[PDB]
Structure 1
Amino acid sequence: ETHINLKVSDGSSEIFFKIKKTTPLRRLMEAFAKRQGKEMDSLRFLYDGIRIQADQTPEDLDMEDNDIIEAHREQGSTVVTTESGLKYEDLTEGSGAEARAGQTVSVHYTGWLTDGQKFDSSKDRNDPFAFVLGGGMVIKGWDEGVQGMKVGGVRRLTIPPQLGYGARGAGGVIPPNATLVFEVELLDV
């Protein structure tokens, strides 16, 4: 009928929007940006690999129900896979001091399963998280993945289970053999 359901993915989670096919996608982009506490200028929305302009409507773009829009936060994106199998991507490259093994770094983070279900966030507690980098106090993917970040940076870590909670998983919310996705913002080193 008159309306269309669109999925918007940012590489970490996915949420749906229902809008009129004749409504300009600006409102969707605004609702997505305001939800993630981000400025509209800082986001790029892509459909069929082509960047969406806010004046364009789903009808203009011949969108179908349950089509996917990608929201990107970075400058060409680069996903690095290290020798351990850890994957990381700098969404924002910081410009302050560099985090190295042995330093106590303070961060905000959100963690999701690879299906998009959030399992924890320091932002939910309104409380930054600090740890000794390389100190064996966090999962291996974090001791490796946070090194090299600079203050002000946001880095997305994709952690295979052997660098996370392994075959066992953790508690009630981390399943066995789970790959973990974290977005980590370095606040202080």
Structure 2
Amino acid sequence: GVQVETISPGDGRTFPKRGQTCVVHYTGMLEDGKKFDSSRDRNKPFKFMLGKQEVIRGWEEGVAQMSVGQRAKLTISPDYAYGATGHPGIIPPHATLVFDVELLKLE
């Protein structure tokens, strides 16, 4: 349920691996075009380690297909996301999420 479209190409050789922290800048929008999250309005990159399932599935599969320095657009299916429940008050049920992710560095 993850669809990855490149916006700006990365180095093309470095790829995240399980147990490696990915430092990213993202901007989450609903498929209607409404913004609901972005780490740049907080001026702080978002760190997470691949494999620990700290984030939704679409991020884990989507970022794994990205390279360091790559800017890509991820279209996450609802079942690869918050799904039928949905983040209450934020993301409606059965919502397709669109993200603009940039893999800043792997640490």
TM-score, length basis structure 2: 0.92
Amino acid at match of 2:93: P
Counterparts of 2:65 and 2:32, CA distance in 1: 28
Q: Is the 8 Å Cα contact of residues 141 and 159 (structure 1) preserved in structure 2?
A: yes
Q: In structure 2, what is the Cα distance between the partners aligned to 1:134 and 1:145?
A: 12
Determine whether 1:179 maps to 2:79. Answer: no
Cα displacement (A) at 1:150: 1.5
Are 1:93 and 1:152, in contact at CA under 8 Å, matched by a contact in 2? yes
Count of matched residue positions in the alignment of Structure 1 and Structure 2 = 105
Of 89, 114, 120, the residue aligned with 2:5 is: 89
Q: Conserved in 2, the CA contact under 8 Å of 1:108 and 1:123?
A: yes
- Cα separation, 2, equivalents of 1:134 and 1:175: 26
1:126-141 alignment to 2 at 5 Å?
Answer: 126-141=43-58
Q: Any gaps of 5 or more consecutive residues in structure 2? A: none
Q: Aligned residues: percent identity?
A: 55
Q: CA deviation at 1:101?
A: 2.5
- CA deviations 1:36-65 (Å, max 9, x no partner) are xxxxxxxxxxxxxxxxxxxxxxxxxxxxxx
Please give the alpha-carbon distance, in whole angstroms, between the structure 2 residues aligned to 1:117 and 1:101. 32
The runs of 5 or more residues in structure 1 that have no matched partner are 1-84
Q: How far 1:148 sits from its partner (Å)? A: 2.9
Offset, 1:144 = 0.6
Give the match for residue 31 of structure 2: 114
Partner of 1:146: 63
Cα RMSD after superposing both structures: 1.2
Native 8 Å contact 1:154 1:184 kept in 2 = yes
Determine which structure has greater relative contact order: mean sequence separation of CA pairs < 8 Å that are 6+ residues apart, divided by chain length.
2
Q: CA deviation at 1:98?
A: 1.9
TM-score, structure 1 length as denominator?
0.53
Larger Rg: 1
Contact 1:107–1:128, Cα closer than 8 Å, also in 2: yes
